[PDB]
Paper text:
Despite the rapid development of antiviral vaccines and some approved treatments such as remdesivir and paxlovid, effective antiviral pharmacological treatments for COVID‐19 patients remain limited. This study explores Nsp15, a 3′‐uridylate‐specific RNA endonuclease, which has a critical role in immune system evasion and hence in escaping the innate immune sensors. Structurally, SARS‐CoV‐2 Nsp15 forms a double‐ring‐shaped hexamer that consists of a dimer of trimers. All Nsp15 subunits in the hexamer can be occupied simultaneously by substrate molecules, whereas disruption of the hexamer significantly reduces the enzymatic activity (Deng & Baker, 2018; Kim et al., 2020). The catalytic triad, found in a positively charged groove, is formed by a lysine (Lys290) and two histidine (His235 and His250) residues (Kim et al., 2020).
YM‐155 is located next to the active site, forming an interface area of 190 Å2 with Nsp15 via van der Waals and π–π stacking interactions. This interface involves four out of the seven key Nsp15 residues (Kim et al., 2021), i.e., His235, Trp333, Thr341, and Tyr343, and the non‐conserved Glu340. The compound mainly interacts with Trp333 via the imidazole and 1–4 benzoquinone rings and with the catalytic residue His235 via the pyrazine ring. These interactions result in the blockage of the catalytic residue His235 and substantially narrow the uridine binding pocket, making it effectively inaccessible. For the YM‐155 structure, there is a small movement of the Trp333 in comparison with APO Nsp15 structures. In nucleotide‐bound structures, Trp333 can form stacking interactions with both purines and pyrimidines; there is a preference though for purines, as shown also in this work, with the purine‐like moiety of YM‐155 (Wilson Byl et al., 1999; Zhou et al., 2009). For a large number of inhibitors though, ~40%, we observed that upon soaking at higher ligand concentrations, there was a distinguishable difference in the c‐axis of the unit cell compared to those reported in PDB structures. In these crystals, the c‐axis ranged between 104 and 109 Å upon ligand soaking, compared to the usual length of 110–112 Å. This effect was also present, but not so dramatic, in the YM‐155‐Nsp15 crystal structure, in which the ligand was found only in one of the catalytic domains of the asymmetric unit since the second catalytic domain, especially its active site, could not be fully resolved. For YM‐155, we also observed redox sensitivity in the biochemical assay, suggesting a putative unspecific inhibition of Nsp15.
Author numbering:
A (entry chain A), B (entry chain A), C (entry chain A): 1 to 346
């Protein structure tokens, strides 16, 4: 361990790479600086709740390969990672507060076989040599692999993974993982799940013919083509901006469509990675706004499947949907056999 | 009062909504965090000169309806608001340092009828029940309403208002208010005033045929059409970029026209809401710059009216114009019956 | 000296201009505020390693004329400036930690003729009266002028200079300087040098017919036209995104071409001004990434000249090129008389 050594690696290798060497370091203002040719240059600003120098080290020792999005790990109940740091780029902080064989200040253990780790769900990366076997010996754990594991039934994970804070479907690298989980020394069967698409509002990319049609076509043209009469897409997806309180607008693709033609404000008042997000929206054009707007990025085809697979005979009820391996509650309101609204409740 | 309760509301409702409940809270680094599933998530970064936890509470209890822009309130001499917080999004801080019936740390009173409030100009919102009557009983105050008040002559305010930091002309909600003011227990007659348009440089929207022509047409074509020869629009509005010191460029629409074709730097060295703004501009293309460039966003039609309504017989003089209810001083330079320049002086 | 006076100047003149007057000032949170109509407004946030009030003063007293880019001054070995502050906008801090006749807290001297300055390479600005003569009397120094100096052989500097953080080729102002340097009281002959173009990725402007062709034409079309077969532009300039480790992509123009069609992430892990830059790149489309990607912004014509002026008979060797007056090392890899790669090594 050495602050100056960590700094040397960041300067010379872009991250911690176990290289020998030292550079001069100063710490002020929750910030780490290094001296370059007689002047101080900022290397790291600490936005975590850890000590500046500890956060610096964990950031430097972050996983720089494609890794599961934090929301996936959280949903599977991961407490800690084996011999790596999953950096949470949404929070600009470590996904997990403790480590195993990374950093002396945050380590609870050097190896995941230590008894302190037993009650924790440890994340194992099958791409790293030996970690598949560690998962077999672990009481509680989650495992990812690129291929088959002998004697374990896989769960096909999302297409996308996070690489240095960039969520992408890898072409030059593999981002689709098989998932395995153990609880109390017993291999679990992971449930059937939809997956969120983890897209952003600005450069929203469609991933189906339906989504291409939605973005290109007008509202009534689209609803007609896919026979979505009575499912209240006008409200739920397209959004209603007629009243002071903004109605619906619960699918990300719907936001992307409007943002294209008419910008608006999104306040991310809980800035973290989560399967579904709450935003305080204010529509700049109309002045329609709402304090808590639940937004989820499902493939529109998946959302259509879900809403078409519900009974529409009651006024209001909770609808449970497994998304990203967690149970998301939706509220379904109907009237005379038609949907009034269908939105996630967090 | 309760920090944890305020936090609960922000997490669950997006703002303070008087709901019961508590969440775990940590305060570090002038920042408020809450614990979500074993990890700390940032709720609020304090950029005010108040204590972090006080600023947090005032922000949470901000007015989330369309409200007057801070510049309007400042110009009318408002010192404090009755039973609400006008959040200043330009400064990312409370518009007023004291409160009435909001927060125990900043309250000077629970109700505006208390004698401490007498010398202060209190802001009353007629949309809130009872506040019209409080204004009648108040010695010093400013009132807004959507409609008529019995026995009071109104002043028609700006078309636009601020909703959650977004200045807009409301369609789904009403943003145009009637204004009333009292001084020493006497109802004032508010002066005839122009209003600034409160637009931004990037997505500048024209609001007249003249403004559409200005943006579309070339300089000489426009000046010809509206017979603006001798009023020196070339300098004042379009701007002169021939010399090291940038000449003119005092209307926002003029900046918007050039930014469209040729980007430049604007240093907002006094970041606050004000009827007219001073910027340190540097033109990227030419290298023409000026330390103090006074810029005001008047409707071009209004600006044309003002400059055409002046005597042009003297070399230099001060011209007073009521804008946003305050007296803005302009310097008018003329030569042989022609304008040389006409710009606001702050 | 006076904090309140410095603040008065910033408020009234946009920078320090030696005007008399005072405004109320508060210092909290490494931030300087001033009181305007009963509310605090932020004037300056300190991002330097100096005391907040010292950094404020140096920033206020920054040079607001076109000045050499910091990388140029660093390369020429400048330690200090005579009677001015070169503000480093890349680091948001003073380029030099000490001053001469600027600020009482940072001054080592009032005038550069003081004996403390003898071992330091002082930067002299010939546009300022008397400083040419000070350079003649100085033991160690660097001088810039707009025109000829009697009895000194000039070095023609870059076309571009920095004006208030904006690098530009001046039209309304002169940005091309003659350079002179003295070491141990002896005038030096500055070496023949290429210059970097100091452009940015987003609004990349071509400055030759070759560069226009590169941006417009496809890869194979361009390589054919300029007979660049065997120089491995496919790898070096255009970049290879086929493997998990990103190959090549060492010219800024190459990044600009791809960013146009396909965005990517650049982590500037040493945020300073330097002749060549190291970035941690992650390609959003492919997932191809690399921790240390050396990038230099040479005019493509200059880069073509350099690579065509090398012997290609050995497997690997270091190639030294004078750029921005400093020796930049390139690694040249060849195979059977063809280039494999040619990239800067820092
Ligand atoms: C309008 O209230 C009458 C009964 N009702 C409610 C809802 N809806 C459906 C709907 C469809 N489109 C637009 C608006 N509402 C109806 C018909 C809600 O979705 C709702 C959500 C959260 C709290 C309460 C309610 C609620 O009471
Ligand atoms: C050039 O000085 C000769 C007299 N004069 C001055 C002005 N103008 C008008 C003008 C019109 N277009 C471009 C430039 N100036 C003239 C003709 C100013 O506007 C001015 C502003 C602030 C301080 C002083 C002056 C000032 O003295
Ligand atoms: C692939 O290794 C076999 C020998 N070699 C190496 C290089 N190249 C050229 C090349 C051209 N295009 C793409 C990739 N490489 C070859 C042929 C490097 O550039 C290099 C850079 C830094 C450290 C080591 C090496 C290195 O060893």
């Amino acid at each position: 361990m050495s602050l100056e050594n960590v700094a040397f690696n960041v300067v010379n290798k872009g991250h911690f790479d176990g290289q020998q060497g030292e550079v001069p370091v100063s710490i002020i203002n929750n910030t780490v600086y290094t001296k370059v040719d007689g002047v101080d240059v900022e290397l790291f600003e600490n936005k975590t709740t850890l000590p500046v120098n500890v956060a610096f080290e964990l950031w430097a020792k972050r996983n720089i390969k494609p890794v599961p999005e934090v929301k996936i790990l959280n949903n599977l109940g991961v407490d800690i990672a084996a011999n790596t740091v999953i950096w949470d780029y949404k929070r600009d902080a470590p996904a997990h507060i403790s480590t195993i064989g990374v950093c002396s200040m945050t380590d609870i253990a050097k190896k995941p076989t230590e008894t302190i780790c037993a009650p924790l769900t440890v994340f194992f990366d099958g791409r790293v040599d030996g970690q598949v076997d560690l998962f077999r010996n672990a009481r509680n754990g989650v495992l990812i692999t690129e291929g088959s594991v002998k004697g374990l039934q896989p769960s096909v994970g999302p297409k996308q993974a996070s690489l240095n804070g960039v969520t992408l479907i890898g072409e030059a690298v593999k981002t689709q993982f098989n998932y395995y989980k153990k609880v109390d020394g017993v291999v679990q069967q992971l449930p059937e799940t939809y997956f969120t698409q983890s897209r952003n509002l600005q450069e929203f990319k469609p991933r189906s013919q339906m989504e291409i049609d939605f973005l290109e076509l007008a509202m009534d043209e689209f609803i007609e083509r896919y026979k979505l009469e009575g499912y209240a897409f006008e409200h739920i997806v397209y959004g209603d901006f007629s009243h002071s309180q903004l109605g619906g607008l619960h699918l990300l693709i719907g936001l992307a469509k409007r943002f294209k033609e008419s910008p608006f404000e999104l306040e991310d008042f809980i800035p973290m990675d989560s399967t579904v997000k709450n935003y305080f929206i204010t529509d700049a054009q109309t002045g329609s706004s709402k304090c808590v707007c639940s937004v989820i990025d499902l493939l529109l085809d998946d959302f259509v499947e879900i809403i078409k697979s519900q009974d529409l005979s009651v006024v209001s009820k909770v609808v449970k949907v497994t998304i990203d391996y967690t149970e998301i509650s939706f509220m379904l309101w109907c009237k005379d056999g038609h949907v009034e609204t269908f939105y996630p409740k967090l």
